Amino acid sequence: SLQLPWVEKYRPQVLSDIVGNKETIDRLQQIAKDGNMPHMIISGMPGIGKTTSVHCLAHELLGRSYADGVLELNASDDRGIDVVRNQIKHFAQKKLHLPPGKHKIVILDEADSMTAGAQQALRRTMELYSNSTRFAFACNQSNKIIEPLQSRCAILR
């Protein structure tokens, strides 16, 4: 049949097992423990543990509400202007009850491939719906994201 690769078999399911960038990992652990997740753009070279880190952060923040509290937008699914205008807006407008301190999660992995217009429409729906949902970006190059998005996020290098 098939054997599970050690890259996925031994993938850390918690933020503590992730090594490297001790300050940022500890701060993410503190955010997950307390709550009030900030908007951040995780940037850096590929294969250093950004997608795993953000997934573990979402796991530790939500728990059982992972399926209905996270909307993941990757390059495989379409991420055009209509996507941002309709499904991200509907997910932000969705009424999901969470314990205090937690918020809905919107993860856009490989955000460097986003079109300019989709990013331009993204800043307003993230500024207006910041009280219910929080966005998380993970891109290889931080220069491919326009300045307004960086002005509304704490860029993680």
Partner 1 sequence: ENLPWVEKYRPETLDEVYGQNEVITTVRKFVDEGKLPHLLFYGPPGTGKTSTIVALAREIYGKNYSNMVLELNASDDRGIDVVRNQIKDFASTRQIFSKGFKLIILDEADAMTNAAQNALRRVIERYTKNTRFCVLANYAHKLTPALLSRCTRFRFQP
Partner 2 sequence: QTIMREIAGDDNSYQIYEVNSNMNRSKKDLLDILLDFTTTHYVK
Partner 3 sequence: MLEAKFEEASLFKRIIDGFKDCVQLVNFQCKEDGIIAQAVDDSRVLLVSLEIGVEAFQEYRCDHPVTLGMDLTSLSKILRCGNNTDTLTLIADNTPDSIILLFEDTKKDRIAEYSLKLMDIDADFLKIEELQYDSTLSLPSSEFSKIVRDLSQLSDSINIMITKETIKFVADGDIGSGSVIIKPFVDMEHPETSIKLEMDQPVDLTFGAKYLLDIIKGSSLSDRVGIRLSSEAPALFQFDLKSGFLQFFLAPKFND
Ligand X SMILES: Nc1ncnc2c1ncn2[C@@H]1O[C@H](COP(=O)(O)OP(=O)(O)OP(O)(O)=S)[C@@H](O)[C@H]1O
Nearer residue to partner 3 within complex by CB, 40 or 92: 92
First to last CA, the chain: 40
Tokens of 19: 């090594």
Query: How far is the C-alpha of 7 from the C-alpha of 21, rounded, in Å?
Result: 19
Q: Considering the rule CB under 8 A, would residue 125 count as an interface residue with partner 2?
A: yes
Site string for ligand X, 19-58 (x = CB under 6 A): xx-------------------------xxxxxxx------
Are the CB atoms for 123 and 148 separated by under 8 Å?
yes
Q: Binding of partner 2 at residue 59 (CB under 8 A)? A: no
Here's the x/- map for partner 3, 82-121, by CB under 8 A: it reads as -----x--x-xxxxxx------------------------
Minimum Å gap between C-beta 149 and partner 1 is 18
| Shortest distance (Å) from residue 83 CB to partner 2 | 12
Cβ of 145: how many Cβ atoms within 10 Å?
Answer: 22
User: By C-beta, is 111 or 156 nearer to partner 2?
Assistant: 111
* Secondary structure (3-state) at 114: coil
Footprint of ligand X on 117-156 (CB under 6 A): 140
Whether residue 117 is annotated as binding a ligand: the answer is: no
Token duo for residue 150: 């960086």
- Helical pair 51-62 and 22-34, crossing angle rounded to 10 deg: 20
User: What distance in Å separates the CA atoms of residue 149 and residue 157, rounded to the nearest whole number?
Assistant: 15
Position 2 contacts partner 1 (CB under 8 A): yes
Shortest CB 66 distance to partner 3, Å: 15
Report the distance separating Cα 87 and Cα 68, nearest Å: 14
Interaction site with partner 1 (CB under 8 A) = 1-3, 5, 7, 46-47, 74-76, 109-110, 113, 140
